[PDB]
Symmetry: D3
Subunit: 323 residues, 6 copies
Amino acid sequence: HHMLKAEIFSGVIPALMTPCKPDRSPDFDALVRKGQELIGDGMSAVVYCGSMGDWPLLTDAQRMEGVERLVKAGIPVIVGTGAVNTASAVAHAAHAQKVGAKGLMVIPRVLSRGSAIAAQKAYFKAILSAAPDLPAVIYNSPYYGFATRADLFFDLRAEHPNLVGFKEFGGPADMRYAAENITSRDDGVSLMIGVDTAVFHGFVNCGATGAITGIGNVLPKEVIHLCNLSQAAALGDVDARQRAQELEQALAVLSSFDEGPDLVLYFKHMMVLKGDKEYTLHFNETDALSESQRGYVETQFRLFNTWYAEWSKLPGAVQRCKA
Amino acid sequence: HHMLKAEIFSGVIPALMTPCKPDRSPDFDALVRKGQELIGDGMSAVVYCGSMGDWPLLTDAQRMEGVERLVKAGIPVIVGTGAVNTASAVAHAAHAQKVGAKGLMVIPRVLSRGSAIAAQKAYFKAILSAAPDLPAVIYNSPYYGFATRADLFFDLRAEHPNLVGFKEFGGPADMRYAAENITSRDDGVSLMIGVDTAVFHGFVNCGATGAITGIGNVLPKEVIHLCNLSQAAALGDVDARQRAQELEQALAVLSSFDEGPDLVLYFKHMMVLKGDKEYTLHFNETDALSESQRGYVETQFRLFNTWYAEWSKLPGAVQRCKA
Amino acid sequence: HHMLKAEIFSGVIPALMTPCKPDRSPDFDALVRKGQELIGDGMSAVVYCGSMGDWPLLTDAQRMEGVERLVKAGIPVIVGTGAVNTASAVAHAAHAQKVGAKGLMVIPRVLSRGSAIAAQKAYFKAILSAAPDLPAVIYNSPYYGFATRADLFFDLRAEHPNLVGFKEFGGPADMRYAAENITSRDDGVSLMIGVDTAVFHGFVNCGATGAITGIGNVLPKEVIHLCNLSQAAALGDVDARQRAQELEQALAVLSSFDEGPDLVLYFKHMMVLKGDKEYTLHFNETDALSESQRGYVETQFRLFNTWYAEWSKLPGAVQRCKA
Amino acid sequence: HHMLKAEIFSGVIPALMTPCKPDRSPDFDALVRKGQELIGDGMSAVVYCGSMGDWPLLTDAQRMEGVERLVKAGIPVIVGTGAVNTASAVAHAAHAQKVGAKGLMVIPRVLSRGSAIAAQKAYFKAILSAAPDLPAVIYNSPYYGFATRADLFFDLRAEHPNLVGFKEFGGPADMRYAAENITSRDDGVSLMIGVDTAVFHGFVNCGATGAITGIGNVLPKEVIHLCNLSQAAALGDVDARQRAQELEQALAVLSSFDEGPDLVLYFKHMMVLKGDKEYTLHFNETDALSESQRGYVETQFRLFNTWYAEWSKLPGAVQRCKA
Amino acid sequence: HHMLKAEIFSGVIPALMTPCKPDRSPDFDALVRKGQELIGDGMSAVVYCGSMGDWPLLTDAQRMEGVERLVKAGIPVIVGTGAVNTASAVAHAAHAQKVGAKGLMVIPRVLSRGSAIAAQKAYFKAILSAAPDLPAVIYNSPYYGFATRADLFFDLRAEHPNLVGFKEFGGPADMRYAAENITSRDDGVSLMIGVDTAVFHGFVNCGATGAITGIGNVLPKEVIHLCNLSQAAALGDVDARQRAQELEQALAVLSSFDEGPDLVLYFKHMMVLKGDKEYTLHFNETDALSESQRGYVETQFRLFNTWYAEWSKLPGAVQRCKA
Amino acid sequence: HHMLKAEIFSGVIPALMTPCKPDRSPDFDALVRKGQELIGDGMSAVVYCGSMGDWPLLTDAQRMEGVERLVKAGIPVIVGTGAVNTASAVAHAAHAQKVGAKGLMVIPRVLSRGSAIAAQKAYFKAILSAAPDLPAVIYNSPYYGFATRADLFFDLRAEHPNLVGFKEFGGPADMRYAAENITSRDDGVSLMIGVDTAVFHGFVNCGATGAITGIGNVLPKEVIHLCNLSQAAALGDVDARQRAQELEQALAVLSSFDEGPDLVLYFKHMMVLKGDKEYTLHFNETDALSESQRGYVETQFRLFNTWYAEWSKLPGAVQRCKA
């Protein structure tokens, strides 16, 4: 069969941060405000609560409250199912379906049996089964000590028709593996870019349908610009292919913070630099950038903004592909 | 100064499994029964709730109930502080001190900022600070994407005098590193063996004071025998050095299950093979050994038991060092 | 079901060398003589034509002639299907069944699509299908740029019930993987030792049913002695476990030539040192040990023989387990 | 001495595929037609039968028939000597000289003694000696488990003056090694690009004289364009250096299929997409791209063609350097 | 505090070669001439005697004579403290301060205790203490079997306020580590580029203040051009960012000789190609490029010069940023 | 030809430490006393000045004075040629021949061109040429960033007949490589054990003629005992093969200090523990074991001594093979 790809996995999709109130509990009003703003800027959906959202630091109830709030605001939500155990992940998925979220981000099993593929298969089945009506994407990362390859992916999809996507945070070779062996069938399966540094490669070299973004919370217009240029390049455009690469290269240092353990520290600090004070505090009192880290990101943020202010005036694909 | 090592980190110490009731909730009565039995067999203390105890699958309340039950039974308890976040780990530590546990097993930060050493330092400080009166051991493993080396260990101990030990699950070279650079000072610091395959190396080559054991839940007398022989070898005994190595080698396959992701599946199945039916079920309904895995452990369990039944009759150190 | 393991994959089984006539064509009369001798010495079967037999240097017709000759002599033969292409491998298998060989050694695809698992699956199916009545073992080695894991093995066996074994030339961890995940089911599947250095580990730690041997062509009685001791150790015998390891250790250097590219040069030279002049020449005129290599093997052969002459007089398991 | 480089190793040189007749035997008429077409398009020579030509799947007689047919058509032929054994490789070389091929591609020993450098030296000598009048290039690849370095190359060339080139399929560092240490002497030695992804690096950074191409069978004009631009860049041209890199980058995904095990599956499928139906079947009945692989290459082929149709209209070096 | 960076570690700074007289003793007159010339060309300082200067081949007295000569000529000198032992390194540092050199390049301990971090800490302290009034940069390289990380760097700087810089010869990830964690504080610390291939990355992505250059001895105007363009790119300039990368890419092969063991052979030969005959001989009579190496560098030197002659005429940032 | 191995490279040979006077200059009287003592204990020769002797910390004159003193005392001396440059190494070699040392230890080039094999070949030639009448051994270690393999070794020996040995400090596989490919010819070439942990493997598995020892300075009788047992095992003795391995295993921790950067700190401290106070100070004022390192070696030294005191009373090979 030839099947339409799931619309919820198309376009540019921020994985939202959870802002803190002054008492270091979640500020759900601020979460919804930012979600609405980002959709207004041109994002197609949001992911909540992912690693950008500090999921391990929040209770399941808090995450579910945030999901509810975002959905009730009319924002298309892909729910993150990251969890300490099967029962928790399944609860996230069941709640997503109950409240009318639009998609599911299936995160592998951690802490108990993480490297066991047999465990991962059962865990994915349990999560998919809990939200059968929601399109689902599996996250694949070497962080888990195992890879979901084509065999496992297609065995899951045979029993779980909601499994329609594959989100790669790993390197370009892993994204290439997915494009060649999983996501280029006729059957409605979507590759999603899952790390900020792989946008051009994903869209142009790998046939990606959409990008889940960290840095796009901070620089939405610039990240949408890059995604648009990269999609135009994927149509064969000559100018856009050149401009996309220039923009990705200039964004590379800021995007690279998404690859490391301090991504929430860096991206919340950049939110603060753009004037959003509610991103000042972290849930853990001692989590903070070092003095050098703060200086480095400030320098690099100023550099990118200065370069973009002039580059973004250029004629041709640069104008055509703005958000 | 020359300081006595902490007695709680001496001897042979099972990291207890949590048995399931038929509804897959914890059977605390059975947990206490086994803890009492193992102390009776010659174990010096127990660890609860560690990875052997399925900590990620239990609520914090359940773990704390188990700790309380064990302490109220008069069992010396080292509390596992494994957690999804700082607040949870600190709560485990605070509860340990409140109820009169005898020691603390400090597990590093996971899932959020795991590889960041700055994060680990603050996390360890928070945990140690929460139970200042309890001797504490830090667990060190490559699983965490970072190592606690001498610099960090001594900076922590300077501010947290309860930090008196260092539990290595990693390879023999990592245990050697600890012995050479951390645990061989005069100052009351203890190296603990933290994987079942490193007992002889730990006691004889590395000066270990005690062993935290997985397989010792199943084969307590045989593991105490190995530890005793290895301690006698550490005094310079010729016979015990030879016999310890023979026994470790024979135990090696069964002990090696402690190194992998399926350790709880293997060790609960061995408990069942020895007649303890309460170890039949797992908290997750689908977690089970495969047919081949079950056959392999059954074969190897029979082999070891047959060999030990005859070897354990030999004269000399083999008799002297029995539990 | 519980099924008997295939008898053809039990015991000690030399992978025969092909001796050269003076014109460097195969000496089939000598091949049959040695095969008969080795069975007489206590070997259970032979493998022909494997890498020990110089398969790439012989035509398919020559290999098939040798197989025919061995079978007509009443020797139980496991046929090697190593080949440059599918059609060749399938021809070897079909001939094996036609002439009444007793088993099949399934070697993976080489030179064309070697690392492609999809290719390997089809290739194995083609070979197994060509000799449905012959018990078959798949050879697994990192040399091929891929591993046959449990999933592939069981998918093949579901469609090809003749697939009943798994021959590992790789390291002890790979043999352990096979024992834990493939060969310890109740269903009649056999692990075969497939490198000379892994005999004790295979029988005792991995449940192996038999060994395919290179060095056993040269030292049949000594290799059968080691296999017998190792099998007795697998029953739980204390003495045999100690003696097996002593004998393996003494054999280790000579056995290690089986791991390298020059195995046929080393083992033919050892045949010559024992008085079998027909092993002097190689099919390629320039293939020869260097002066240092020749000196090294001569020294090590003398050393082992001297040690064994005295060690093999010891009482107990050493006498009980002789061929 | 200063010596002219061998003309046969200059320019752009497809390693031809062998098309199948409907019965999966070679279609030699079609082979010659394509060879003639590609020379007409601007290729300087062809390689037959290399890995692109499915050498392991064909008999020696079939390969030699194809070589004869190509030579009799007046096509300059470099003969591939890939073989299962020395006698076969030497036969290919002797036949090449007999029939008037123009060059020799010397492929290392496989399957027997592959990693032994002593074996490789003798094997190369045997092949070179069999066609003394034909200029010869040695193929160097990590696939063989050994590298031909300067010492071996110059020892061979001292005794075999026909050895005048060095074809690198390995990475850019290996090509750099060859340029720095082997091929930049005054003495008539040529570096040949031997993988489709290394064209610019080879010509500009490494002094290459020519390229043996896989993708150039499918996209001859575009590959000649890239080679021409890269050669102009090697003269110091500013525009060509920029344009060469743009074209290589756009060709990179299609070229990357040359690096993997499925190169013949991908490139025959692309031939089919361009209308050459005789490239439909493979010699092995079950060798075929998967559905995803087919979708991936189709998408990427369309993308490249669309981009090139517009990019190739640009003024300057892009026009000057067309085939 | 916010502190000005040390001016001596700004700009472009050649690590000078020591030319030989015909008797293979140092030609100090020629050393001073070249130092003066390079300052005249636009270099800000020189380093002497570093690895470019053949420090291990010269006596301490010879190095100190060269330093004296350069300082007396009015050239700003950063003194290299590379040494076989602590006493030697400290003597270099003490002499630097005595004669009025402007900075210190602190090279780690070698040959005795090289991998011991405790040894490195004491060694750095000894060197820094010997020249307290001179700004100092520590060289960091994997060549030493250890890395100076932030902890060690800041512990040294707390006791040695002259430690104000960090020179990275390692890869881009190591330079990134330094920028993120060491050199981006407000406190007057400078990252210096310490390998010729990392200029753009250092200035733009890592906030570098200056570059110590090998190839800049040979191509001073072109290296200053690259540094200027890269510094303009670090201000946010669009044109300069593009042009810097074009120039770095064209310089990449010549710059890459700085990464290898033969850097002095390559760069002295290039000096000879530009007409400086005093760079003909080496201190060791047999040290010389091979014929292929000489051909390779000659080809690549001609290529770069031809490309630059035309590229350097382009309007815009290329003109603005010339030396 | 069949040639006698060089007697100077036979037996057990300490690489002497250089004791310090209270002013941290060399105590040559003490050096000679210890050298004489060790010969009296049963050592066959000494090496001076090697890394054990702190060569990088001493002047060439000091080393040569020590060599002279040892030779004038009638001790057979193998001179270490470790050096910062060719001229220094050659001076050591020339002096060795002048004063009547009995052998040469050829150490590779460091600090300048270390990884360049062309450089190493010329450097070895220069050193060998400077002492043509002295038997010479080349040291081979991965520390140098290159390996001397058979090709280089035999090319050197063809022009330098004094090159008669090969000293391996690397792992067992590297020693095996040497035995198989270099040192097992008939031609008078000797493999020397060059790290304390490889004694049994060297003599029994690799045909070594002698051992250069670090720990043997401290425990001469025990190291000679191990060497004697290992040599008896190399004759085929059953008892000695078992006892050698027991003794090596017990010595393993103390021997392992020879593998690391702190070998001189550990072995001088052990000399002090045995009552030799002249081994208290190091040439560098701050070089000292840490508190933990000191505790570790003290514990392990006591353990070994206690075990040996009883083990060394056993009948059989243990008595026969004492010094």
